[PDB]
Design a protein around this ligand. Sequence first.
Ligand SMILES: COc1ccnc(NN)n1
Ligand SMILES: [Mg+2]
Lengths: 151, 152
Amino acid sequence: PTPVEEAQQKTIEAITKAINYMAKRRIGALLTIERDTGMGDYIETGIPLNAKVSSELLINIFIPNTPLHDGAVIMKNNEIAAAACYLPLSESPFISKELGTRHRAAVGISEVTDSLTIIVSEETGGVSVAKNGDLHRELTEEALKEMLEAE
Amino acid sequence: PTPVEEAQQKTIEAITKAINYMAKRRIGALLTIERDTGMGDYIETGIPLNAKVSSELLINIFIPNTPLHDGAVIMKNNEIAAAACYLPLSESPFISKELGTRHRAAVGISEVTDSLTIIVSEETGGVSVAKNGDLHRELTEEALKEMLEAEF
Ligand SMILES: COc1ccnc(NN)n1
Ligand SMILES: [Mg+2]
């Protein structure tokens, strides 16, 4: 593997470790990975970080009742660009009616960008991914890894 | 003021806001500001962040029972270089006997660098600074801000 490929794999590993920790503890989380569609306007609504990715930093960001947990982390160029960012809420009538604004925000950004967003539910610890306007629910760890590698 | 001066003032405002929040809630914290003596050897022992400073990130780092809360945050100019860093423990007899590892680590790094370290006690909420081998305890918010402004 090249240094770029090793860097992507290390980032995937950091993401999945953090997601698993939060799912176990039913900590709500919202993590959007910018792709070809720029999301600077949304990044600018949050707290700037421009931080190296680590599972530890991701977990510390989403701790309940802390400054940085309310909103979305947005990742760009293999770094955490900002935390506590605003995402647009989807008006789609085809999202499961039991879900709240976290999932609607993930679907909403997925409607107007090619980004991939990961959501951890605070009600169940379930893990889902929003892309292209659809929400993929009740993912296993292997399913999430496959989506991150495919992306 | 120059951009460098404005950035310094922003970083001091972020630090003081974080320390004040943590002091009020008895959140233990250990925050070393690198000066002219390079601290790379200690930065390398922690989790790399290389992150822009904010009061919100500093507070989130030290929340008890989280991955990044144990060990020192080391700041380099206007960045949080790393968290959960090791610092050497001082054996100075002028550290109050009731104080724990955070204060001893702060004095310890202050004996081998020109850095300024801020400590929040999880027992009392009191704020102290370690510099040049000396620990100064029970600082007011004004005293801390003045110390930080004088450092730059
Ligand atoms: C890290 O990926 C995932 C997905 C679904 N559940 C979990 N852990 N309970 N991890
Ligand atoms: Mg006194």
